[PDB]
Subunit: 242 residues, 4 copies
């Protein structure tokens, strides 16, 4: 069974992704195309390359090209240092092939928004937030109810139940209003298995805390991604390339 | 002297801007194309329409198509409500015609980033931040020094003095990495007068406090745009459309 | 009544057209943006500027940006000189605002194809060709039957009957197969009056004979455009700019 | 040595090419993505897939997405049937990966033009045309002289001699005007080996006589592509897909 992605498969994967990105005018510089841009959520997901990104089979694998991840700490009153981690600015372009997913997870600090550029994006999420740390939190524009799931959605083998809690559904297309995914909400999304093209979506969010193999001292070693499936909560880290 | 823009001049201005935006794949919704999107920074700037947006003359007027201005207050610990106004997520496409400017100003709370989509962007700014209050302010990655202004830049008549403090200069082009403009920094920008196309720039910043059309009680009536020129300061809002 | 287009209206018209073109990646160089690119079919059509290109009123006015018009005579056996005028290569980008048309006409020599890039294009045409010169002509892929006209089409005032002979209709969208309009077929097209954006279509055709204010001697002074409305068959020539 | 391409390698190749094409707004229909679109010029060129399309190695292989190949025979006077094969309209998007080439060859009948959409195109050609027959041939605007080849160009092993006659060189970039390649001129082109993206070029030419999948009886079985290298000449058609 696949336990890693060959160097050829990885380079072709990231090279076509970055080319598609540039074609769509996304600002891609060389340092953005690296060994951690092509993510495989869990070792059992390397099997996605047994048949390839165009097999239309359900797997949690994607490429992320990050053009910005600004802490936005400069100029902030020291008084706000404690919650500065809930702010910041991040701009990423995400490429998901037909039938593949960004697995169920949530962020304690990061609030994000989606802009579909190419293809269509099916988002699965939980309208009710979880509570992390202090129970006292602000509220303004609670997550919408969306719709129930459509029929025929193929979920990854052995990961089906990690989607049980993401009962709301919304299908996003290019040109639709920006979709906001508030922090502390379980969410996931896939590119329709029958899509003629890879899904390309721009994510604009607050700072993305993802320890790489510090704006403020309390930001060091901060992990802001909590995955439902324990198996994927691990792989998100590094990519096994052979 | 022009004291307003005609309905025809306005509708054509906004219609061509929205078309250009859609062509570049920016998500424009009908609600984004409104009578507040075409901005004229001061009553003496309505004169820009005496000769038109292709006269290549120096005036402070522009179009802003805002696709997102998310408070990002939901899920934020109440303990951080006092500095929430420094966060949030704003996504807008700015369209500036040849020779025109986004007037000198700074934001106490908003930190922005620029992504040139079409044409080129000449940015003028103060490398040193203005001191709003005095209390401890955080630091991490101060504004780069930049370069001196090139020769040839024509400033708006009567407003040239307001650009005196913006000694640093940088020319951004499509494909360049993201350029960050930290809060409390005086800045302005223009589309080169010789440009064959309007400057089209995607701005991703923190929340934009601009009563144009409340997430938190404190945010009510808050204005986070302070312009160097008084003329553009006060009479900056509502656009006079005849 | 309008008998010409002001210099401001023309420059704004062509400048936005060329910017939209470049945004769509069409190869536009300065010599392409000239005094003959913005066409007004007949002096009675200058009235289109009384209310402007965004009034959605029916008029026969459009901009044509020609990037190629290659005779393709080089290398051709001298034996084919006689019909060389039916060959050649022409590449043009056409921009038609909401509700405006490219008027009923036909070409004796030019065969063309359409590729909608932005917006939608409604083509009105005659499936049966006319005979010009010798009656003996080749046949292979006769023009399709298309569909009858949809309801609600607003035709230009005083030009309604020039559309009587173009009974077939087809609506083209971005991504559809190339639509071929064989030579000697009456045709016209408009941008839906309710369109949010100007129609942008790429035309790939054989050489475009349009005497400007010679590959082969018999090509000198060749006029290959025959308009139904005599009033437009004249204006096609030059553009009255004041 | 590789003697064919696997179904997976082929489907990924064509799928990513079609996606990139659609991203750039080229009109791709399902029928355009077929088993004849991925071209391998000679059995010894299948070795390009030993290391892949991103190995940046010199091989003669490419993808052609043909949206149009119109005879333009309809309405053509019978008197010009003998030279109809030199006319017609062909529109195709060519996708060439870093380091790869469109092998040396000339067309007796087809005249082409290039429009670079993404990346850069290095064209190698003979400024003087080859003399097919001898009969009078027409002239109007002979091929420009061009410049000498730059240093660094790696040619395909075993085919380097076939490029000896293509002494002229020109580097085309997106936004450049159309570049015409008159018929009877030997030519070849490649995507620079250091390119971060595949070369994407729109070709507009006269009819392409290439029995891949009759407008005139004479056109039956006609092949208008003559390659310098015999290897690529004969075994150029059908792609061996395992
Ligand atoms: O760069 C300028 C941005 O902050 C703009 O959205 C505001 O200044 C509006 O004038
Ligand atoms: O430049 C090359 C073009 O003629 C191509 O469409 C053919 O040569 C196919 O090999
Ligand atoms: O994934 C492979 C290929 O890319 C697809 O087209 O068919 C199935 C095969 O396993
Ligand atoms: O941060 C990455 C992505 O930007 C987000 O949408 O989902 C989690 C993933 O690790
Ligand atoms: O005064 C302006 C600016 O502040 C200075 O740095 O360069 C000249 C310009 O006019
Ligand atoms: O054409 C003018 C304007 O551009 C449009 O929006 O409304 C009608 C007016 O006459
Ligand atoms: O040649 C122009 C255009 O390219 C064609 O489609 O219609 C006639 C007009 O004059
Ligand atoms: O032989 C090739 C070409 O014909 C010549 O002009 O430059 C060197 C190259 O290898
Ligand atoms: Mn997420
Ligand atoms: Mn600002
Ligand atoms: Mn025509
Ligand atoms: Mn060729």
């Amino acid at each position: 069974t696949r336990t890693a992605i060959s160097r050829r498969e990885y380079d072709e994967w990231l090279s076509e992704a970055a080319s598609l990105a540039r074609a769509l005018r996304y600002p891609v510089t060389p340092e953005m195309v690296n060994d951690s841009a092509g993510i495989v959520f869990g070792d059992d997901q390397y099997e996605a390359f047994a048949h390839g990104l165009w097999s239309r089979e359900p797997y949690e694998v994607m490429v992320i090209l990050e053009s910005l991840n600004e802490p936005a700490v400069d100029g902030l009153p020291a008084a706000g240092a404690a919650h500065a981690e809930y702010s910041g600015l991040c701009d990423k372009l995400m490429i998901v092939h037909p039938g593949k997913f960004c697995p169920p997870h949530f962020h304690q600090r990061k609030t994000e928004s989606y802009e579909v550029v190419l293809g269509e994006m099916e988002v699965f999420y939980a309208p009710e937030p979880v509570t992390v740390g202090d129970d006292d939190v602000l509220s303004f524009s609670p997550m919408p109810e969306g719709s129930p799931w459509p029929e025929g959605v193929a979920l990854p083998a052995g990961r089906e139940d990690s989607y049980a809690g993401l009962t709301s559904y919304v299908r996003l297309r290019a040109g639709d209003p920006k979709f906001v995914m508030h922090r502390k909400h379980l969410h996931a999304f896939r590119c329709p298995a029958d899509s003629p093209v890879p899904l390309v979506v721009r994510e604009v969010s607050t700072y993305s805390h993802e320890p790489t193999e510090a704006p403020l001292p309390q930001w060091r070693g901060l992990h802001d991604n909590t995955f439902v499936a324990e198996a994927a909560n691990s792989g998100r880290l590094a990519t096994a390339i052979a």
